[PDB]
Amino acid sequence: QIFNFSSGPAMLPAEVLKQAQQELRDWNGLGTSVMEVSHRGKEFIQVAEEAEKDFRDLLNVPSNYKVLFCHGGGRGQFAAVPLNILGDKTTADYVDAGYWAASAIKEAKKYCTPNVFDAKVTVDGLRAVKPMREWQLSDNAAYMHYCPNETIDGIAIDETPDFGADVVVAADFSSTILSRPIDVSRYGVIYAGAQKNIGPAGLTIVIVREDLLGKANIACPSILDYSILNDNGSMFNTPPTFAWYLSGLVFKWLKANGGVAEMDKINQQKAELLYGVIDNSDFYRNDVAKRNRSRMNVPFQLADSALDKLFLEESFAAGLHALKGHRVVGGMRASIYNAMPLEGVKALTDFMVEFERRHG
């Protein structure tokens, strides 16, 4: 009855929350919560090992990659990436195609001189991104950073990186990881805040290629040092245990429902249904090129913005929450992450048609 379209923190699988709620005070017949046990006890160590295993199976992460669970969120990584894989070099390439990509560039300036490449273009009045083959990388860059999914702009770069063996790719997968199959071997570093497709806020997952370890700056706090996290099994210090446990339930939920392949198909239908309604309407509009349309974050605008308030009041009353767009861009936005069922996207589109019919 209630469908939550929050952009992050976002909706978690209903099934997962039922289990967490039921075991909140007595987990594993221990008579205590997962939140009350030591992270060094065998009970939690097993939960942490299962979670990493399930995640590796879900995305087919090769053996030469380390999977780390840490504090800091996505913005913590804006600093952790340069602090870890910059080495003795003083420049890195940063591709800008949205808010998050730009925010990463801002943080990077504290550690190096980033060579920025603006990939934004407007083709046919629609917002698109230049193909990777046109991206200009520099000769002595330590790595190249980009964001494949911009939550505010509703822009996605699905293209698989294919640069030389000489190029290290770092990417912010916070709002799109686990939504479709990806080739991890093409990347050097993949990071993602958990609060959108993985679990609750407070945990971050990082996938690092082995050979990139060992060259962290001495100024890097130990909690953000990939080498230290790796050496200690992401347990250098007390990790966010409840968040790690919930993320583990989500991975099991994904596996039980067909993995990333099935998730990809359902996400395709969800997106097609929504963009179809928007495109066929004179009342709603999305200005992103088809090739770069995000299936996770769908921003749109009403032809008559004077109806914004009424759209939000009625939508909320119909049980459709968090449809207001980001503070910086205005308009509306429906975030339809993995946890969001097709029936939820259908309830939204049904309301959109009815609203256009009554006030359009």
Place this chain on the structure above:
Amino acid sequence: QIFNFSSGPAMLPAEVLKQAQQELRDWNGLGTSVMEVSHRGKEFIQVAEEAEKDFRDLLNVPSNYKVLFCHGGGRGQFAAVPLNILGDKTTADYVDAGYWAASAIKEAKKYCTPNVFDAKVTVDGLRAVKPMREWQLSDNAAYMHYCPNETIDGIAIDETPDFGADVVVAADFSSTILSRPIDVSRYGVIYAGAQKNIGPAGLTIVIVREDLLGKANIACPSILDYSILNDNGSMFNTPPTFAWYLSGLVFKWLKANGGVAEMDKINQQKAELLYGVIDNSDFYRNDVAKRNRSRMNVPFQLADSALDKLFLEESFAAGLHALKGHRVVGGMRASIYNAMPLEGVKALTDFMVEFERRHG
């Protein structure tokens, strides 16, 4: 029936967990969990403002102090303190009286050359700490750092700092904050990982004197920068929302039960009961000077270590969990935090007498 003596993550107030469980899937009649709503939505912003307010009331934090909620845990602050309040100076005084105090010194070496002061002394064969009047601070130091409660050693420095107005005191209150009343105005920085007395793991609370802001190192990751956190109301990036909400329930639980003054009184009864049993027995022994005995972490050894395993087997069977001491020190350890009721400490002591009477 089951009492959890885990040192951190630790037991949370039973009443707090009952509430969190009931509202896990439908918080505030929103039809969603606290974990699924935006941190920028009016609802969560209110939870965050009350948590801060309640905390300020509990410890009587003056207006010239900022209360920040951040990622990283206690070990994240071992780096954050130097990165934030070192300024132009290249040295800081560090008082060493236990494991945590020493760990802080190790991290501080990445940012400055710390002047270490060993405050450990053995008086009458019992482990004690030198009075603060005997601590040797340096002229050139940016600040002085110490840890008032060592969880592994069971050592506590309750003495109130009273150095010049030109000495900035930074302290690690992770395992003792909210257990007794303190004079916040005597400190420059007070930090504490939440997993011991405040809430679940994944959240850290920092109390900073305002004039200490504005001089962070440029290498400090923005998520650890006190100025940035302050400017953005601890919401520069997505915070660990569930942990912040649970911490808020804990503060309300404390207020409902008499605040820090009542908590101090119950903690006195708990510690006296336990240390009394240990001191009156030849079978159990604690080697810490009375003046430095922690009321939160009570480590003890059996006279016959060959009974260690049987002590743990039987104690666990009697519903007394996590009594094993830290790997580094061996022996046993009962962590009796705010959430631990007197009845829980009584159940333990009853078992200890019965075990000695049966195998002693």
